[PDB]
């Protein structure tokens, strides 16, 4: 299912570092450094960047973009800088705050940005502009903005919510209007929010969760104060959002806690599926220390996009969750949760920061700094071609021959991302650089040259005929083998990004973000773009968020495969979809809730004939059978 | 069988005598036997078979009929394509544009069908509430009705002011310009050229001095501005503002 890479990283600074960041972006994450004296900069390589950012005035906090390359720090004296890497440019804010700038968020949109000082002075900005001020009583921890669930005309993304240590929370925007709720009180930790229920988490030292429940009007208590049995260290406390509605606590102890607000259900993640992975592991000429399998946890950190949450051990070993469950929904029991092999460390972990670029992980355990990267099987079929990405380096490729099937081991100088044929030649694509190989088929023996390496940077690449289309979340461009741009063309903004791409034959295919879906020929030497662009979208309503596409071999049929967010409801939906580029209708098929569809395969040389994967989703089936079963069934004799 | 090989209607009459007359209604339909299949359409309500028997009438040239028809089968984009096509209703097309809430390609389809009337600033607020608001900004400022598209605008984003600007001001209109120049969050540009404005728009630059106080050259060259302006004027004005500036 997938392979965990880790890099090793020379921090080469005789000053302790403080902070660490990770970039965002989609494509070529960088990482940043923040150490009582100098700011550091890094790229995905792992090398120091040549352009220093360190500065006399001391640096206190930087925050990430996230969906731009646009940095965020907050100096020692209040004062904020904005800074874009991609075209070194900087600008300044002098009177930012007066007192030490604590913690900086920005809202999904990137819009608006909020920052608090010790003193309790909140500063809206709009961009980089000051906007609306606020004093309030003793220092803020934190603060995230808040949509509530109110009428279209009020509305508006200005809205968040502030909690510290002052146990007050108040309801604020740029308009300069303070909704004052305060209640609570103590040393709050943490403040989460939840959309459907407009519901605010407050997580404190008490060990008690507050569910707080406020309306655009009328103030209404907390309905429930959740007691927790955590025998660990309270200030150490941390919990996480997964999923829909899951809640992911750990207090430096050796349980990860679990609790599921629909039902109300508390479970626990354990360390003895370590005791089995130790046991399957320590089988050979290992050099493994005794089992110590009640180790506490020091940091737990979820990516949505590889669906991996990571947390580590102080004795210093990294593990790793996988979310099987399908859909955004988040899991209901252990079952749907699978564990993965775990990477051996040193030393005992500091700190875990994710980036959202394939999961990029930064592991910091004292003064060591290291990467860690996710990737995903991947396997390419072309005529008399198999291609299988076994490991980082090592990739399988298999040759039908009728005496016999032939197999051929390929090792690379590192890691290689993705991969791609076309019955000719073979393309891969790194971090690095870009590669082609040509494949030369002989009973005795197969020898792949390379043909040629360019230094490119590109999302995907799909070779053809001679010709390579290189693809960026917002263009698509064709490379020759000597390196000239033929054409090369843009998207609208609002249209979404490019996220994946799939080809077939002559016809590829590309899904944006805003269910969105381009269909674009390449049989010619240049792609030509066929019909117009077509939203996910019925004439009663939209149907839902895409997930998954195929294509036949002709390109008249489009099988979908997408999730309607029933806003914390139905398990997305079992029910798929086939496009017919003719009729630009959406024929919409139903099958038995006992499976959900998960990703659909289309036949290369039949246009009629597809084929489907479902996932059973065995919740459900014990439900029902629990509910049918108990009725007039008691003592049933024999062949059971 | 006998459908599979060429004859069609004889498969429907023998579908009607046969107990099942689904497929004879839409064979009916694909047929010109569109008076057998009235009665059919009447008392069944298939939603695909009410589309195709609206494609075939749209396609024998009944333009009233395959309307209603589309109308009760709520597939109401074919219902602005029959207006293109015949009716060219665009007022009922807006009508049924705002009951029943288009989304972005039916605010493409209406910015299509505003094409074919030469003022397009219809065009103009379809596409703001397309949302789709980079080719209708060069659209807009092209066809030289960049007044009301900006003033829908002015609170969306601020990264093209200047353009705006400049092509606002090309127009030889500078009364709503300097509006927008205050409302663009410049201070800097919006004092420096409220220098050029004439007396009367003082006053809403006094208010800007309410709204910006963080600046301090805006009040500094407003008055030396006025010192040497024309013949002396009314003190009492003056003195009001000089006693609000503090």
Known sequence: ?640 | VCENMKQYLEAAELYQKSGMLEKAASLYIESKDFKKAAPLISMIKSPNLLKQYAKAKESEGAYNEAEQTYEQAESWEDVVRLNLDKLDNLRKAIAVLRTKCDTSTVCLMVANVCEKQGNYGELVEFLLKAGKKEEAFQKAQQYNVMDAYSDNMKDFTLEERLRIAQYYENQGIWVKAAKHFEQAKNPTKSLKLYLKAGDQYIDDMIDLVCRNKQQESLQQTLLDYLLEGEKPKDPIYLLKLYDKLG
């Open chain 1, 1 to 640: 299912m997938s392979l965990f890479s880790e890099l090793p990283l020379d921090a080469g600074t005789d000053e302790q570092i403080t902070q660490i960041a990770v970039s965002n972006v989609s494509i070529n994450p960088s990482l940043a450094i923040i150490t009582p004296h100098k700011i550091l900069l890094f790229n995905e390589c792992g090398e120091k960047h040549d352009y220093e950012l360190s500065r006399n005035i001391r640096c206190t906090y930087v925050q990430w973009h996230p969906s731009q390359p646009i940095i965020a720090l907050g100096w020692e004296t209040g004062a904020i800088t904005l800074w874009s890497e991609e075209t070194k440019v900087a600008k300044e804010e002098p009177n930012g705050h007066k007192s030490e700038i604590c913690l900086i968020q920005f809202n999904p949109s990137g819009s608006r940005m909020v920052s608090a000082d010790i003193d309790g002075n909140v500063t809206v900005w709009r961009g980089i502009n000051i906007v609306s001020q606020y004093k309030k009583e003793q220092s803020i921890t934190h603060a995230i903005f808040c949509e509530l669930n109110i009428d279209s005309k009020l509305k508006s993304g200005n809205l968040f919510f502030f909690g510290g240590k002052s146990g007050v929370v108040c309801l604020a925007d740029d308009a300069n209007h303070c909704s004052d709720v305060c209640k609570v009180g103590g040393s709050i930790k943490s403040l989460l929010f939840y959309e459907k229920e407009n519901s605010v988490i407050i997580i404190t030292s008490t060990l008690l969760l507050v569910m707080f429940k406020i309306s655009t009007s009328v103030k209404t208590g907390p309905s429930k104060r959740v007691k927790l049995s955590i025998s660990g260290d309270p200030q150490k406390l941390q919990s996480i959002w997964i999923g829909s509605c899951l809640l992911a606590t750990c207090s430096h102890e050796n349980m990860l806690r679990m609790w599921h607000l629909d039902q109300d259900d508390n479970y626990v993640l354990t360390l003895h599926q370590l005791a089995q992975q130790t046991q399957t592991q320590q089988g050979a000429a290992t050099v493994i220390q005794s089992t110590n399998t009640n180790d506490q946890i020091t940091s737990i950190q979820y990516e949505k996009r590889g669906k991996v949450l990571v947390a580590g051990t102080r004795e210093g070993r990294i593990i790793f969750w996988k979310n099987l469950s399908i859909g955004s929904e988040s899991p209901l029991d252990v079952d749907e949760w699978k564990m993965l092999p775990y990477v051996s460390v040193r030393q005992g972990v500091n700190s875990i920061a994710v980036g959202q670029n394939n999961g990029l992980i930064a592991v910091q355990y004292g003064n060591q700094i290291s990467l860690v990267q996710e990737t995903v099987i991947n396997g390419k079929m072309t005529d008399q071609v198999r291609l299988l990405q076994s490991s980082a380096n090592t990739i399988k490729i298999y040759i039908n021959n009728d005496i016999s099937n032939q197999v051929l081991h390929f090792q690379s100088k590192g890691n290689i991302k993705g991969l791609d044929c076309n019955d000719q030649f073979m393309l891969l694509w790194t971090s690095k650089t870009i590669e082609i190989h040509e494949i030369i088929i002989n009973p005795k023996e197969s020898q792949t040259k390379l043909v040629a390496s360019i230094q490119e940077k590109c999302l995907r690449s799909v070779i053809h005929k001679e010709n390579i289309i290189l693809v960026n979340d917002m263009e698509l461009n064709v490379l020759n083998f000597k390196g000239i741009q033929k054409q090369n063309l843009k998207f609208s903004e609002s249209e979404g990004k490019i996220l994946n791409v799939n080809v077939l034959n002559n016809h590829l295919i590309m899904w944006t973000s805003n269910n969105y879906i381009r269909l674009f020929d390449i049989s010619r030497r240049e792609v030509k773009q066929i019909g117009v662009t077509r939203r996910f979208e019925n004439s009663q309503g939209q149907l839902g968020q895409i997930r998954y596409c195929a294509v036949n071999s002709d390109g008249s049929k489009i099988v979908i495969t997408a999730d309607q967010r029933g806003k914390s409801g139905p398990q997305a939906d079992n029910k798929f979809y086939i496009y017919d580029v003719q009729t630009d209708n959406f024929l919409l098929y139903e099958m038995p809730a006992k499976c959900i569809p998960l990703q659909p395969y289309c036949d290369r040389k039949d246009r009629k004939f597809f084929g489907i994967s479902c996932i059973i989703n065995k919740n459900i089936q014990q439900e029902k059978n629990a509910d049918e079963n108990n009725d007039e069934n008691e003592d049933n004799k024999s062949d059971k």
